[model samples]
Target: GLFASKLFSNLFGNKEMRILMVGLDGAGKTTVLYKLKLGEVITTIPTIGFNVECVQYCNISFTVWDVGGQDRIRSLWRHYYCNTEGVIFVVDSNDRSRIGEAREVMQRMLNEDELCNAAWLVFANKQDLPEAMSAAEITEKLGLHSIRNRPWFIQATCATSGEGLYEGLEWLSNCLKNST
Candidate 1:
């Protein structure tokens, strides 16, 4: 059965997707990658330009690119944006100070000719933290209401706990299917 194998494969099989994770440093972008790849928290230096990880979820394969977040390294971001079916914009829900920066990054992606048609999945990560902001708050501050033309979804997640990550992915896959 596809569902059974899918479940088993997600548990222990090889399936691949080309996913790009972008966010400011300390936004848990790399941590999410490490969690998905290594299956647990481990020490990791910040990504310099990008790091690729192969992840399999129920026979589904993903080639995840954890891109660098340093301001000086932003010129390299556009390169990864090409040919990606979906873009996961991870945000630090606890870092209220940087919401403006997150909005700027999202706006820039929408303006890019290469990624204009890609589905946007905004991960309001760190939902378990005491300082974490609500998805509604983040959406409102990010002006998501005005950017309604794009197919988008906001997910509350705790990357450390791996909660809500797959839900976001499923939404992304469905969005891509329907649009095509």
Candidate 2:
């Protein structure tokens, strides 16, 4: 079956999932993207526009879009929502003061018609920080419980250490597979 599935994927091209990553500025969205791609952390300037990368894992290809999260650039996020299969919403777990803002942005994004069908993967990033909130707390504070229309999962992650990143990816990959 492994050979058969591999052959089928090769013949038809593997399933390609388009994922959009969004959150408030300094939430470490860029760091997570690069960590998954390069398996290491790198210095990142604030994203003014967007960055796109294609990565492969477990026979699936991912087209990941990391957009600028500044308040001024929030409007541009809707432009990339079309055809997105999933969303990776990053959060600064240590930034308690702005979590409410993050929630507002996420709520607005989810209400978009183009993204209504997309699955959600919330990353409570910066978990390495001493003050970082746990994934459970982030879930409650982010009002994730209100999302009943689509699938969602919250995973704690530390981009610099790469902790819990791959697990998040695996969970996302599985969710996509099951949805189809």
Candidate 3:
């Protein structure tokens, strides 16, 4: 029982953390997951309900949940919200047309669950795409300033290029550590 005891002690002693990723469709959640795992771009089918991946860092295991962003599947969002430690709210940095929709969803989440309390990392995804909107514009449109005392990150990432992926994850890992 010594092995089990040590494992349990280490797990429960610090923090058993979980992070959830949510955003509109084509926000690069799958790409980010695959890149983080394989360190290369691979073709991925659309996530239906949610995809869970366990990643270990400094003996801390983080359960990252990538929820489906399709409009038809959004109802499943609440089922994953409970006990969430942090949230990565991704946005298609180039898609200005969807800014209103994204803001509405964020506002709704805040109203229902006070998601503002959770550490939030916003990925300004698809930065490498031609004509992509700037991270500043996405920040302003989302009105992220309204979140009080919450940690926010607007990372410009090109998932296809594997650029800014690890740095962002490192930032995320550190945020989770500090937040706990």
Candidate 4:
């Protein structure tokens, strides 16, 4: 990788990834957003607003958008769906009762015309809960197994601890690089 590094750097350095990080209310989507932003403790209370930021990683430039996924904001998701190359759907692993709803809404989101070509990343969040669902369980509960067309991945996450965060983003970047 000595000589190859420089040549590849020039090409990969200009790569850009537009991401949509969303989920139902209290699913910790915003927590993951701020976790990546501050690289420290997350204390931001959920509110109505679009939290978009540029996170330049190694040779790739990434812009992640996380608007609150509350009842009102969910209807406006179409506004941000434009230019999205990836979708990181966060889920509350411990909320078994709402898993069905998440799957329903997630499927609804994917059917949108623009997202058909985007890669999907499911962040099974809240691993800190003792009874939290495993990553595979969430994948099944979220109905990811039935998905087709675009590339997709799921990772167990403890957003507060920042675990699995990098791995999820890494998978997304790799998919983008491979697709390009």
Candidate 5:
């Protein structure tokens, strides 16, 4: 059955998605990656470069690139923009002070010509925190409403507990499928 399903999928089309995960430091990108891949959270140091993982969901396969979020390595993000089908822009919902900075970075990223067609998936992470911002607040503060060029969604998530993670992925999958 598994082999037949694989053959059927290949015969139909390649249900593969290349996703770029971007956000500022401490936004739980790595945490979310592991939670989705390994079904458990793992201790993660600051990513100096990038981590690549292939995750299978429902009938689609996703190749996710979790890149370093520090200011110095942001320039390198452009290198991975090519062929990217979607973007997972994580945010530390509890970090109110850096919301503006996050908005700036997100805006600059979306402005890139190479990524203009990519679907945008914003993860308002750390939602378990007492001071975490809501999805509506993050959407407004991030100027998500102003994004008219591409399909976008904002999901509130607690990466540690793996809450709302798959829902975000489901939305991303639907967007990618529909766009194609």
Candidate 6:
């Protein structure tokens, strides 16, 4: 019986995965996190520091830590990058004024060597807006197609009507299976 524990751990990775959700301020990372947890659009105030929630997924518990990206403190993201197996990056699809900056910010964040193998999920949130950028636009803007070593996928989301939320998780789940 004692060896069963070790067998389970070695065989199944304990049926758990750690996901880190991050983005620039006002990108709706918190809203998306709440939507995934509650299946409804919940009003969320600005995240002071971070929020951790457990989401059940295909016999795998995804413990997601949505870290707050206060504009001045983005340098502190390294604190949460340790041992993260997945990454969810939220973007403001309607924010045309700062999309370029968003790209640079995200690109620098991903360059950190510690997050090399983590599967990346991009959430093009605020898609319900009349002027929201398309998923294709964000892909090019973020230079996602150039990522060579890690797996990444982007999906459009309103985050209010709950559209394309679980679809993101399903992609992550599929990515996890192939790697694990």
Q: Name model 4 segments beyond 4 Å from true.
A: 1-13
**lDDT of each residue in 1-180, candidate 1, tens digit only:** 978877676544223456778777767788777776677867757778988777776445666787887686677887784656667787889988887887787777777777776767788877889888998999888877877777666778887877777676666555544224
Give me the runs in candidate 6 sitting further than 4 Å from their true place. 1-6
lDDT of 4 by residue, 1-70 (tens): 8888877875754578788888787788888877775676557577586778788775677788887777
Residue pairs in clash, model 3: none
- lDDT per residue as tens, model 6, 47-70: 767778888978888878888866
Candidate 3: stretches off by over 4 Å? 1-10, 13-16, 114-117
**TM-score of each model, paired residue for residue:** 0.82, 0.88, 0.81, 0.85, 0.88, 0.88
Clash totals, every prediction: 10, 0, 0, 0, 0, 0
Model 5 residue runs over 4 Å out of place are 1-13
Q: What lDDT score belongs to each candidate, Candidate 1 first?
A: 0.74, 0.82, 0.74, 0.77, 0.81, 0.79
User: In model 4, how large is the Cα lDDT of residue 104?
Assistant: 74
**Residue pairs in collision within model 6:** none
TM-score of 1: 0.82
TM-score of 5: 0.88
Collision count of model 6: 0
lDDT of candidate 4 vs native? 0.77
Q: How accurate is candidate 1 locally (lDDT)?
A: 0.74
Q: Sort by lDDT, best first.
A: 2, 5, 6, 4, 3, 1
